[PDB]
Amino acid sequence: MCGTEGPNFYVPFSNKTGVVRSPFEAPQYYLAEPWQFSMLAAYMFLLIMLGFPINFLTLYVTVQHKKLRTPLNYILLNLAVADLFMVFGGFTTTLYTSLHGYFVFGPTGCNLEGFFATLGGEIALWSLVVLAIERYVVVCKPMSNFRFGENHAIMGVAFTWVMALACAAPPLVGWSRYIPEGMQCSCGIDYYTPHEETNNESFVIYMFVVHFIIPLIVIFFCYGQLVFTVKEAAAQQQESATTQKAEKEVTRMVIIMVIAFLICWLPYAGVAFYIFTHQGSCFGPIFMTIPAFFAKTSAVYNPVIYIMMNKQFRNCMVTTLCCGKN
Ligand SMILES: *[C@@H]1O[C@H](CO)[C@@H](O[C@@H]2O[C@H](CO)[C@@H](O[C@@H]3O[C@H](CO[C@H]4O[C@H](CO)[C@@H](O)[C@H](O)[C@@H]4O)[C@@H](O)[C@H](O[C@H]4O[C@H](CO)[C@@H](O)[C@H](O)[C@@H]4O)[C@@H]3O)[C@H](O)[C@H]2NC(C)=O)[C@H](O)[C@H]1NC(C)=O
Ligand SMILES: CC(C)[C@H](C(=O)N1CCC2(CC1)Oc1ccccc1O2)c1ccccc1
Ligand SMILES: CCCCCCCCO[C@@H]1O[C@H](CO)[C@@H](O)[C@H](O)[C@H]1O
Ligand SMILES: CCCCCCCCO[C@@H]1O[C@H](CO)[C@@H](O)[C@H](O)[C@H]1O
Ligand SMILES: CCCCCCCCO[C@@H]1O[C@H](CO)[C@@H](O)[C@H](O)[C@H]1O
Ligand SMILES: CCCCCCCCO[C@@H]1O[C@H](CO)[C@@H](O)[C@H](O)[C@H]1O
Ligand SMILES: *C(=O)CCCCCCCCCCCCCCC
Numbered sequence: 001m002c003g004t005e006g007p008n009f010y011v012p013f014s015n016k017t018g019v020v021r022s023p024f025e026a027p028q029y030y031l032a033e034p035w036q037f038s039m040l041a042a043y044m045f046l047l048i049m050l051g052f053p054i055n056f057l058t059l060y061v062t063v064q065h066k067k068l069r070t071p072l073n074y075i076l077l078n079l080a081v082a083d084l085f086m087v088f089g090g091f092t093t094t095l096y097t098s099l100h101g102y103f104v105f106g107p108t109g110c111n112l113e114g115f116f117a118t119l120g121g122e123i124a125l126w127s128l129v130v131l132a133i134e135r136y137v138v139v140c141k142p143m144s145n146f147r148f149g150e151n152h153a154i155m156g157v158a159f160t161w162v163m164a165l166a167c168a169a170p171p172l173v174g175w176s177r178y179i180p181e182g183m184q185c186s187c188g189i190d191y192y193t194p195h196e197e198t199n200n201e202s203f204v205i206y207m208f209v210v211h212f213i214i215p216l217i218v219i220f221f222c223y224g225q226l227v228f229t230v231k232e233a234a235a236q237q238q239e240s241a242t243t244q245k246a247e248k249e250v251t252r253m254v255i256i257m258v259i260a261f262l263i264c265w266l267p268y269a270g271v272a273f274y275i276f277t278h279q280g281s282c283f284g285p286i287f288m289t290i291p292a293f294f295a296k297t298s299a300v301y302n303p304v305i306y307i308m309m310n311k312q313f314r315n316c317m318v319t320t321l322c323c324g325k326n
Pocket of ligand 7: 318319321322323326
């Protein structure tokens with residue numbers, strides 16, 4: 001008997017003591033000490049203080065510099081919006097609920113936070129995928145007579161919205177469900193409960209295949225062929241020191257991006273491999289949600305990697321932060 005079941009929630013704590021309470025009604029201080037909820041609050045505060053400026057500044061600097069408004073950069077703006085969904089839909093709400101020690105907005109707010117937090121994270125996920133596909137098309141030139149235009153970049157953005165809705169919306173209609181997860185202060189997809197009435201098992205498989213395996217294969221294929229194409233072309237121009245420098249930094253950046261993607265991706269795979277095997281034992285509120293606890297940080301380091309390290313964005317932000325000088 002691992003936890004306590006109830007309508008619209010699963011508390012990862014046995015009720016044999018009788019101390020369990022609804023995560024919508026009363027604080028869950030048997031799951032964790034109050035200071036650990038405070039540390040959860042401090043972590044959300046860290047993510048808000050670092051996440052909102054970086055992502056809002058990305059939207060703001062784009063308004064001040066014409067050179068940034070390239071179609072290849074539209075997907076990076078879509079990434080910055082998605083992170084803001086995570087920052088205001090998820091991190092802000094969770095900071096507030098954390099300090100109460102339970103999800104005070106009830107099951108209705110659970111679907112709101114769940115949707116928008118899941119939507120924001122999903123849009124970011126597919127934006128990284130779409131950027132990889134866009135860069136692969138532009139460099140490797142797989143189509144004979146193709147030019148990447150404004151119309152094409154818009155489809156890529158809309159495509160993320162469709163994919164993110166494909167994951168964040170079914171839990172509201174009847175396929176899986178949103179419940180308080182971990183310490184019960186935030187809400188998300190329910191892969192902790194084999195809820196037959198919403199076919200949780202089929203949604204977890206669909207999530208694992210479409211939104212967890214496909215994004216990885218695409219990112220690895222696109223960036224692989226790109227580094228292959230770039231290293232192939234540079235080999236024909238070894239007389240050019242700059243071409244070799246460009247090839248080196250492109251390879252280094254692709255590695256950083258792919259490593260970063262794996263840092264958010266592998267925890268969910270290690271924890272799941274601890275569900276395919278080692279399935280019997282109960283999982284504390286921390287363990288099932290260790291991957292989530294660190295995947296939230298993507299709202300900070302993804303704009304650092306994909307935007308802050310972009311050569312044009314960087315100088316423009318310095319100019320904007322410095323009131324036009326330097
Ligand atoms: C996890 O485990 C705990 C412990 O079992 C559960 O908490 C119990 O929840 C039940 C509700 O299902 C509570 O029972 C109800 O208590 C009400 C309040 O009683 C208090 O006040 C009276 C004086 O009025 C005291 O004598 C008593 O000791 C209590 O302190 C009662 O009003 C309810 O009675 C009504 O319903 C019953 C049917 O259950 C009828 O027979 C009555 O006539 C009346 O209509 C009822 O007795 C119980 O008090 C809770 N216990 C504790 C320790 O909190 C969790 O709900 C459980 N599940 C989770 C968390 O999901
Ligand atoms: C963006 C999130 C909404 C998105 C997610 O929250 N998840 C992935 C699928 C999910 C549930 C959680 O389903 C799985 C099945 C087996 C192993 C791991 C699994 O993760 C996600 C997080 C990190 C990386 C990619 C996507
Ligand atoms: C931006 C930060 C706002 C924090 C608002 C937190 C308000 C917490 O409010 C407290 O919640 C407790 C339950 O945990 C109650 O028992 C207390 O009576 C109540 O004061
Ligand atoms: C590199 C990938 C970028 C996207 C990472 C998004 C991480 C989102 O993390 C997810 O948040 C959801 C809502 O809080 C929860 O339901 C999930 O448990 C959690 O894994
Ligand atoms: C998902 C795709 C990631 C592509 C990462 C490719 C990393 C290649 O890395 C390169 O491999 C060469 C092999 O000859 C070495 O000689 C180079 O020193 C090294 O930079
Ligand atoms: C050392 C840090 C370990 C942290 C493991 C996860 C602890 C609890 O898990 C967290 O609970 C929160 C409250 O519901 C959720 O909002 C977070 O998504 C979840 O990661
Ligand atoms: C020019 O490029 C920049 C103009 C001068 C800015 C100097 C001030 C930067 C302060 C950033 C660090 C603030 C830390 C606050 C911590 C809460």
